[PDB]
């Protein structure tokens, strides 16, 4: 429990009371930049895979239909 969790030394920690500080300091001021900072940091490691998924999906659907499509030479 608390008190026996870990041993740190000389780490001072300042803080403020909730009612004393603005609730949403610069929320959209820096939030947007940060959210954008964040996405560019993982976008290249998340989207690429799923992009190919959209692709396989599409190719798959179209291919199936073509298979169903009547063969012109068929019956002729």
């Amino acid at each position: 429990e608390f008190g026996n969790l870990a041993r740190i030394r000389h780490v001072i920690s300042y803080s403020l009371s909730p009612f004393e500080q603005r609730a949403f300091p610069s929320y959209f001021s820096k939030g947007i930049p940060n959210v954008l900072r964040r996405t560019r940091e993982r976008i290249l490691r998340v989207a690429p895979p799923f992009v190919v998924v959209y692709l396989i999906y599409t190719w798959g659907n179209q291919e199936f239909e073509q298979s169903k499509r009547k063969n012109p030479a068929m019956y002729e």
Partner: protein, 412 residues
């Protein structure tokens, strides 16, 4: 039947007060309205370093001459500095009353700061600051002042940052000396076997011409501080014990409900647990300083908080009577000794502008009942944002949501 404290005022403006009693060991003392609150972060250790140096060398008494004189009559020489007041006091015999006053005159004016002496002190002050960290409760109360008065001159310390201490110029000091040692901001207080008329004469001869005019009308002024509820948690797990101080904003010197708050402190697990009412001008910190092993700080906090709320909600007449009796024995008087009486005068003339007699204190104590005590405690403790300062193994010390929220009883 307690003798009244008689106050006079000299042209310079310095107030030469006094008091008289059968005792024969008077404590003469100069109080100055100058502390770390009047410093502007470029001279944050000027009062402390002038205090350390003031005794060591004066123009008239070169080198250690003063400390010899003081030895010759067997007198004792003391000085202290707070965030708002500075005091230079001498305990001596009655018959040595003139020379002591003359000695005090040198200490406040005509003082000599030997650049050499400056250097020697720099060492003393730096080293001590380097070892002062040893005293935890001092570290915790400095942390509490810093986090409670963030951005104001009340956060800084009497000692000041190491930097300012290293960098000090005879000229800087000279400024602080020539700026914050004005005659209207000075009280010459005497307690014990002294005559007021003789002290008033001595005052003029040796303490006249005390400066009163600032430079280029750089008349200082003051800022009403803000009490920023906040915490500071200096975690160092190698220390054996933890010191935690929790405070709220105090009323100030001139607000009479201080007396009622004192009764509340007289009403109030983890080793030492002292309550305190630090009261600077226009603000103060009511609170508690509890030391405790790392595994009990949590409970203590709760106990402390509990006690407070009890005082906001369920104060009874018996504990109020007990607190009034406990307060009425903290009355300072001739039996408290000269130095104590001496000190009060100086603080009373600096803060209230007058010496409040003990009969007025007794009247303000006996007008306090349980209803106004829980009203004033609800005004100052209930649903207030505290300042928290912890030092030691303080991991189980709860964070700010648990403390603040604990300040309001969902049952009232």
């Amino acid at each position: 039947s307690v003798p009244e404290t008689q106050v006079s005022i000299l042209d310079n403006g310095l107030r030469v007060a006094s008091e008289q009693s059968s005792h024969a060991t008077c404590t003469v003392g100069v109080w100055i309205d100058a502390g770390s609150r009047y410093e502007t972060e470029k001279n944050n250790g000027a009062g402390y370093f002038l205090e350390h140096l003031a005794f060591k060398g004066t123009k008239n008494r070169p080198g250690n001459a003063l400390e010899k004189e003081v030895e010759s009559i067997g007198a004792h020489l003391n000085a202290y500095s707070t965030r708002e007041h500075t005091a230079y006091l001498i305990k001596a015999l009655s018959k040595d009353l003139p020379k002591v006053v003359e000695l005090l005159a040198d200490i406040v004016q005509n003082s000599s700061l030997e650049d050499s002496q400056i250097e020697k002190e720099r060492d003393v002050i730096l080293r001590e600051m380097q070892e002062n960290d040893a005293s935890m409760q001092n570290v915790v109360f400095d942390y509490l002042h810093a986090t409670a008065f963030q951005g104001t001159p009340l956060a800084q310390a009497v000692e000041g940052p190491s930097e300012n201490v290293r960098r000090l110029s005879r000229t800087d000091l000279t400024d602080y000396l020539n700026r914050h040692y004005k005659a209207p901001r000075m009280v010459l207080a005497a307690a014990g076997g002294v005559e007021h008329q003789q002290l008033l004469d001595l005052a003029q001869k040796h303490l006249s011409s005390v400066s009163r005019v600032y430079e280029e009308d750089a008349v200082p002024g003051l800022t009403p501080c803000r009490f920023t509820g906040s915490e500071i948690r200096h975690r160092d797990d190698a220390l054996p014990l933890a010191h935690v101080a929790i405070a709220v904003e105090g009323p100030g010197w001139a607000n009479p409900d201080n007396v009622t708050l004192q009764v509340a402190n007289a009403i109030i697990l983890c080793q030492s647990f002292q309550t305190f009412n630090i009261s600077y001008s226009d603000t103060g910190l009511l609170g508690a300083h509890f030391v405790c092993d790392a595994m009990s700080i949590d409970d203590m906090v709760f106990f402390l908080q509990g006690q407070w709320m009890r005082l906001c909600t369920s104060a009874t007449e018996s504990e109020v009577t007990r607190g009034k009796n406990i307060l009425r024995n903290a009355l300072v008087s001739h039996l408290d000794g000269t130095t104590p009486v001496c000190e009060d005068i100086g603080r009373s003339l600096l803060t209230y502008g007058r010496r409040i007699p003990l009969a007025e204190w007794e009247s303000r104590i006996q007008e306090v009942d349980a209803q106004m005590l829980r009203d004033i405690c609800s005004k100052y403790f209930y649903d207030q944002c505290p300042a928290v300062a912890g030092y030691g193994p303080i991991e189980q010390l709860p964070d700010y949501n648990r403390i603040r929220s604990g300040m309001f009883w969902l049952r009232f």
